[PDB]
Ligand binder design. Structure first.
Ligand SMILES: *[C@@H]1O[C@H](CO)[C@@H](O)[C@H](O)[C@H]1NC(C)=O
Ligand SMILES: *[C@@H]1O[C@H](CO)[C@@H](O)[C@H](O)[C@H]1NC(C)=O
Lengths: 104, 441, 441
């Protein structure tokens, strides 16, 4: 019988009813390494950790993709003025940061 | 002095609060429910039981036929059968071969067990809710009284006045129609009186156990006697009450949610945890002491020696303590992080006392008051063991209870990294749009 | 057959219909509702009356001092007055100079007038609604029966099933707090048990008429017996019943809207003319008659002979009928424009009979069915010249009643003039839009 924190009352035959409560004592280490962290919370709250993990991978994915898109956009908007004008000097700071090939 | 609060509708566990009148020593009260009963207003629609199909001795007339007549009896049946020719002991009985007729009437009535066992059909309404409350405050010992849980009716518990109610939730375990049998109730949709359905629950419907009127639909056909013997053979649908007893549902005593037993004499729904109750208690002014007579505590620090977030009081902490004078002082933690088992603590001059508590947090950062002075206790709890436990939880869990100060650190670094990449991209757009849109001309 | 309808919850107005089950003569149905008994479920909370202060004999202990306990009594005082020299006839009653005791016990309890008068306070709930109804159908005479107003109750009125569906509106004159006094009720909130305000209403609060507990709260104070005369001088607020009688509000029955009168012993509001009632009357089939038996009526011509839109039936008209054979007809208008005084007309051949009717429209257009036939007749009515009268409104007014058929003409010609002028504009724009733009081209 799956006994939750709210408790379970079971009656067996003519015996008086017995109430049992399941204290939140799972496996896993709440501290320490990430794998033990995730297993402790999965045993504590299975559905919550699954949706939480899915949300967190989702939010890091969208943020990382949007960031790289923003960055590569800026990279283009940095090089293209110099790209188009091959005969100018490409400032060293721009050269190393919006990292650039030296054009002819 | 009037103090208001909200207390969870959970019977066993006491509810501790510290009513505080500025200028007086804060007096510590305790409110413990011991009964909370949902009493619905009910009326008896009818009662049902096994029937008895009594057969009057049939009348048999020789060389001639009687007729049937109707009498005001539950499920009365008459059927004159022709050419009976009965054969009693000591010879045949009725002279005339053919032209012999037997009346053979039956009728239905309450069995001799109705008075002992009988289902009772009830229609219930919203009704009232009342409870038995146990109060302590200051030096006054525990005093109990019965109160009506509604926002208006007060109760003079000892010398304090107490107003409890309403329940935050109007839930009751009972549907519109219920049936009580023995000592258990069932949420059955019983047939409205006078529409019994010949053998499922309503086949005998007597308004009261001793009511002369009676409704009965046992489908009492009356078969002819055969082979020249004297008897009244009938076929009849078996007792609806018996069928109901065999195919009885799970009783509401075993199926009701929130865990309340059903008691019977007023038809209570006893001790189930639904929502919370407001509390409005007027403490007598004579129970408040002046501050000057009570110790004032300063230069406090608390150090949680041990703590495991178990259901019982699995936390021991100590408090470094300096006072104004010796005496007895109450203690309390307002927040829901931890519940303190001790109520008052004796305090020397410049001692250090200990208290016990129960918490649900991995990291129980809670505030504790000792005679109008707060201390913050941080600690770091450790998992309990032994799984199933017989006693209820003494604390209330919150959503931010299981986060263990590395998981916090992880969601911190994750959101920080995510925001940092996003904001870096934003600043990148700013600088490119600055050097390029402007600052090339 | 079953006939369903709806009806004004009015008290003297008869409700007239014709049941029409095809192939039979129409049959005339009359329902009259003679009281409207809205019965609210109530619980007595507490009763109250004038207090009376019994001052038991004082204890005069001479030299020395007694002390007195708080014996449990409503609003009990007991105060020892030290330094008394009670000076009776034939000697002073004590041999000490000073250091004498005068105990001054006071105690308050219900007066004996509480037996005969008491403002008992209830708590109103939704309750049930029922009514006494009077039916008339066919040639059967009047048949009266009380009826629960709820769809779920057969209420067999004679030989027909009458189901009166739950009252359209659920309005009740009574709020949740009502206090009954004598022959009247008050829609007054009452400070309930133990919340007695100490002097306006709840000075005394007794749970029932003969209850041993009494929540007196009357602010009894005791004073020093002056100048050594034995007596227990007590000063306190006058009775709450006094001020409640003097500043008593208007009784509910004098304020209850919708002409709602109140009766007492069930605490019921009668004749309460709010909203409407559904009706479902299942008439016997035997009261009908085959259409082929029924007379033919033809070449009907009805003429209004004088009408005046009075409350009472202030219109007389004549119908010229030609007939097949002697027999009865019902005459009612299927529409609210008229109400016909005459239930049935039992009619010979080839003749011209007169019927009375009541209406408020100033050109009635009743379509009145004599013996499953039809005839429509109209004409002018004039103002009946009385101002205020005491007969309630027999007819129901609709908005399209007062327009005098010149004002109808006036608004018609006005609305036509606006619409036609705009249409003339629209035609002009189109014809210039094409003749002048596209044809020149
Ligand atoms: C109130 O609590 C005290 C102590 O827990 C107990 O002795 C007493 O029986 C309780 N009251 C009732 C009515 O059970
Ligand atoms: C029914 O209506 C008739 C109409 O005259 C009246 O005489 C009779 O009293 C009414 N029934 C009752 C019960 O009052």
């Amino acid at each position: 019988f799956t006994v939750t924190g709210e408790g379970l009352e079971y009656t067996w035959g003519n015996h008086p009813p017995k109430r049992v409560w399941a204290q939140e004592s799972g496996e896993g280490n709440p501290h320490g390494w990430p794998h033990e962290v995730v297993v402790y919370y999965y045993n504590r709250y299975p559905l919550t950790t699954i949706i939480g993990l899915c949300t967190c991978v989702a939010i890091i994915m969208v943020s990382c993709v949007t960031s790289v898109w923003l960055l590569c956009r800026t990279r283009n908007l940095c090089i293209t003025p110099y790209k188009l004008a091959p005969n100018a000097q490409v400032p060293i700071l721009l050269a190393l940061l919006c990292c650039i090939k030296p054009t002819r | 002095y009037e103090h208001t609060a909200v207390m969870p509708n959970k019977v066993g566990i006491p509810y501790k609060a510290l009513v505080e009148r500025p200028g007086y020593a804060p007096v510590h009260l305790q409110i413990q429910l011991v009964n909370t009963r949902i009493i619905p207003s009910t009326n008896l629609e009818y009662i049902t039981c096994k029937y008895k199909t009594k057969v009057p001795s049939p009348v048999v007339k020789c060389c001639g036929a009687t007729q049937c007549t109707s009498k005001p009896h539950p499920d009365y049946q008459c059927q004159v059968f022709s050419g009976v020719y009965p054969f009693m002991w000591g010879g045949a009985y009725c002279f005339c071969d053919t032209e012999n007729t037997q009346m053979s009437e039956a009728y239905v009535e309450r069995s001799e067990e109705c008075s002992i066992d009988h289902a009772k059909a009830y229609k219930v309404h919203t009704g009232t809710v009342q409870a038995m409350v146990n109060i302590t405050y200051g030096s006054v010992s525990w005093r109990s009284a019965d109160v009506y849980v509604n926002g208006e009716t007060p109760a003079k518990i000892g010398d304090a006045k107490l107003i409890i109610g309403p329940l935050s939730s109007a839930w009751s375990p009972f549907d519109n129609k219920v049936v009580v049998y023995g000592h258990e109730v069932y949420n059955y949709d019983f047939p409205e009186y006078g529409t019994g359905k010949a053998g499922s629950f309503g086949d005998l419907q007597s308004r009261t156990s001793t009511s002369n009127d009676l409704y009965a639909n046992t489908n009492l056909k009356l078969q002819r006697p055969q082979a020249g013997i004297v008897h009244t053979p009938f076929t009849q649908v078996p007792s609806g009450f018996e069928r109901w007893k065999k195919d009885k549902g799970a009783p509401l005593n075993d199926v009701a949610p929130f865990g309340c037993s059903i008691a019977l004499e007023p038809l209570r729904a006893e001790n189930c945890a639904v929502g919370s109750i407001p509390i409005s208690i007027d403490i007598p002014d004579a129970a408040f002491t002046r501050i000057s007579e009570t110790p004032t505590v300063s230069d406090l620090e608390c150090k949680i020696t041990e703590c495991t977030y178990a259901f019982d009081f699995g936390g021991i902490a100590t408090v470094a303590y300096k006072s104004s004078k010796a005496g007895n002082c109450p203690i309390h933690s307002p927040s829901g992080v931890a519940v303190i088992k001790e109520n008052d603590v004796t305090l020397a001059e410049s001692g250090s006392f200990t208290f016990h508590f129960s918490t649900a947090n991995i990291h129980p950062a809670f505030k504790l008051q000792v005679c109008t002075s707060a201390v913050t206790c941080k600690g770091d709890c450790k998992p309990p063991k032994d799984h199933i436990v017989d006693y209820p939880a003494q604390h209330t869990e919150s959503f931010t209870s299981a986060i263990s100060a590395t998981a916090w650190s992880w969601i911190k670094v994750l959101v920080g990294g995510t925001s940092a990449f996003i904001v870096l991209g934003l600043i990148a757009t700013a600088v490119v749009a600055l050097v390029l849109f402007f600052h090339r001309h």
